[PDB]
Amino acid sequence: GKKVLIVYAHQEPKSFNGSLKNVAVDELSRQGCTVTVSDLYAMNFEPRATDKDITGTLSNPEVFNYGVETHEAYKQRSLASDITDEQKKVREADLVIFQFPLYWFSVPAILKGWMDRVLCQGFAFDIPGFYDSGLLQGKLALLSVTTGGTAEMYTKTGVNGDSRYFLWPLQHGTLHFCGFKVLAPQISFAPEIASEEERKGMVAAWSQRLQTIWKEEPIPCTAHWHFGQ
Amino acid sequence: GKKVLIVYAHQEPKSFNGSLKNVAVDELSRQGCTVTVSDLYAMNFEPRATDKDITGTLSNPEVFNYGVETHEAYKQRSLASDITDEQKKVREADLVIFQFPLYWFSVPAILKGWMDRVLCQGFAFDIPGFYDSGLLQGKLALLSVTTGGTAEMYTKTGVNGDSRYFLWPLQHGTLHFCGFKVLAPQISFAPEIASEEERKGMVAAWSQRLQTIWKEEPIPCTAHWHFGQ
Ligand SMILES: Cc1cc2nc3c(=O)[nH]c(=O)nc-3n(C[C@H](O)[C@H](O)[C@H](O)COP(=O)(O)O)c2cc1C
Ligand SMILES: Cc1cc2nc3c(=O)[nH]c(=O)nc-3n(C[C@H](O)[C@H](O)[C@H](O)COP(=O)(O)O)c2cc1C
Ligand SMILES: COc1ccc2[nH]cc(CCNC(C)=O)c2c1
Ligand SMILES: COc1ccc2[nH]cc(CCNC(C)=O)c2c1
Ligand SMILES: [Zn+2]
Ligand SMILES: [Zn+2]
């Protein structure tokens, strides 16, 4: 049996991102997987890392240290319920798919906020207690990203540089750091500029890939994979 | 004369980030510069990119496209006032300093939200009108980042890889894309693990650098600068 969490960050259900999230639910549900979706915009998910993330009394109310406070709150079961609800979904998942449009070579702020607030010390990693000593080892993660720029722009000699260059903070700095095994990213280039048939083709390629997702090996999440030849 | 905008993202005024922001205000004010600070957490700055960012009739209310709607809203002067207030500060600034702790090899979500919402099409870039032709051409930008990890961890052979690797989405994908000339980053490594004297030393090195900031040349914001080869 297999459980999947899809963390989805798009405002418009009729969007191309919406279509990719819906075909992932459809395909994984067809396989008999247990599927949960965190639709961040529909949840009005809080992105800001603030003292409202800890309930009750702070370890040090005079000098607020977000990392220290959330690490202690996690251990004391005093984190805000929106964070713990997401942590329960991650803890139970075997695969976490992130579905989002690329915003400034990174995730939209609402999804950056999910990463900042949900992946706290004690839950996803400890200090020390990261990368392969991370706490989400055994779990798979996958970035399903859509872009405005064409594939050609995202080549080593292209204006944007290779698409792997922007994946480093997300795949390595975040997912690998927490102990996830990183599956190859799904990059859907320039859907708004594509034809209706080309968009249908991109959606079908993602659905087809999901049919055999449990047979994939993760990428070697190294500097060489992201920046080398 | 010169005008500086400091976009600051830290919850705690007593923090090391707070000390760096304050010494920048002190030094630039001593030089006779005009200084403005956007303290994002104190402003409870909205990070989410939503339809609340447009006040008028949407160009397409049936299928919401944030990029299209904000581009049109910028041209019509129908953007939310919190965005327009930040744009006025950026338009007037000769130098924009971003002061923040590194969160997941990137900016905290509240600051990612400032980038997503403030740097809209029509204001910060256009198509064509990006990279060396970006609309913020002639302006300088500088990232002043603090980290948990030591300098040694942020080297090519270190666990985190070189610090320049994580700068790519911010310096190139965002600042250079909008036409800014990027000054060399100020990276204050591991202040929480440092001694009180070492922290004082990092604050003084930043103040000393600011004394001659107007004499600096920008970096060559290229893939070669960030990744080598
Ligand atoms: C705030 C913002 C920032 C964006 N930044 C990028 C970027 O860095 N690179 C890129 O290729 N496209 C960028 N885009 C374009 C989106 O990635 C693109 O519109 C989206 O992936 C299309 O998918 P959708 O039709 O489902 O929205 C940006 C769009 C917005 C609104
Ligand atoms: C949500 C979160 C994510 C962080 N991610 C990183 C990271 O990617 N790399 C790093 O070296 N430190 C990371 N840190 C540690 C902070 O960068 C560090 O505590 C801060 O820069 C210290 O400055 P301050 O004392 O003024 O807060 C993170 C902290 C938090 C709370
Ligand atoms: C809440 O603190 C966080 C969150 C995510 C993180 N990624 C990297 C670090 C730096 C940790 N430094 C050492 C020496 O262990 C980190 C800290
Ligand atoms: C670094 O590339 C960026 C940064 C911000 C952006 N906002 C919107 C787009 C592209 C939107 N699609 C087209 C081709 O019009 C975009 C690209
Ligand atoms: Zn890695
Ligand atoms: Zn560049």
Curated annotation (Swiss-Prot), chains A, B:
Cofactor binding, note field: Binds 1 zinc ion per subunit.
GO biological process: quinone catabolic process
Residues where FAD binds: 10, 16-19, 102-105, 146-149, 154, 192, 199
Catalytic reactions on record: 1-(beta-D-ribofuranosyl)-1,4-dihydronicotinamide + a quinone + H(+) = beta-nicotinamide D-riboside + a quinol
UniProt binding sites for substrate: F125, D126, I127
SUPFAM superfamilies in the record: Flavoproteins (SSF52218)
GO molecular function: chloride ion binding; dihydronicotinamide riboside quinone reductase activity; electron transfer activity; FAD binding; melatonin binding; NAD(P)H dehydrogenase (quinone) activity; oxidoreductase activity; oxidoreductase activity, acting on other nitrogenous compounds as donors
EC number(s) stated in the UniProt entry for this protein: 1.10.5.1
One GO cellular component, as annotated: nucleoplasm
Binding site for Zn(2+): H172, H176, C221
Phosphoserine modifications at: S78, S195
Activity regulation (record text): Inhibited by melatonin, resveratrol and 5-hydroxytryptamine.
Keyword Transport among record annotations: no
Keyword vocabulary terms for this entry: Cytoplasm, FAD, Flavoprotein, Metal-binding, Oxidoreductase, Phosphoprotein, Zinc
Miscellaneous comment: Uses dihydronicotinamide riboside (NRH) rather than NAD(P)H as an electron donor.
Function, in words: The enzyme apparently serves as a quinone reductase in connection with conjugation reactions of hydroquinones involved in detoxification pathways as well as in biosynthetic processes such as the vitamin K-dependent gamma-carboxylation of glutamate residues in prothrombin synthesis.
Family: Belongs to the NAD(P)H dehydrogenase (quinone) family.
Assembly mode: Homodimer.
Entry protein name: Ribosyldihydronicotinamide dehydrogenase [quinone]
Biological source species: Homo sapiens (Human)
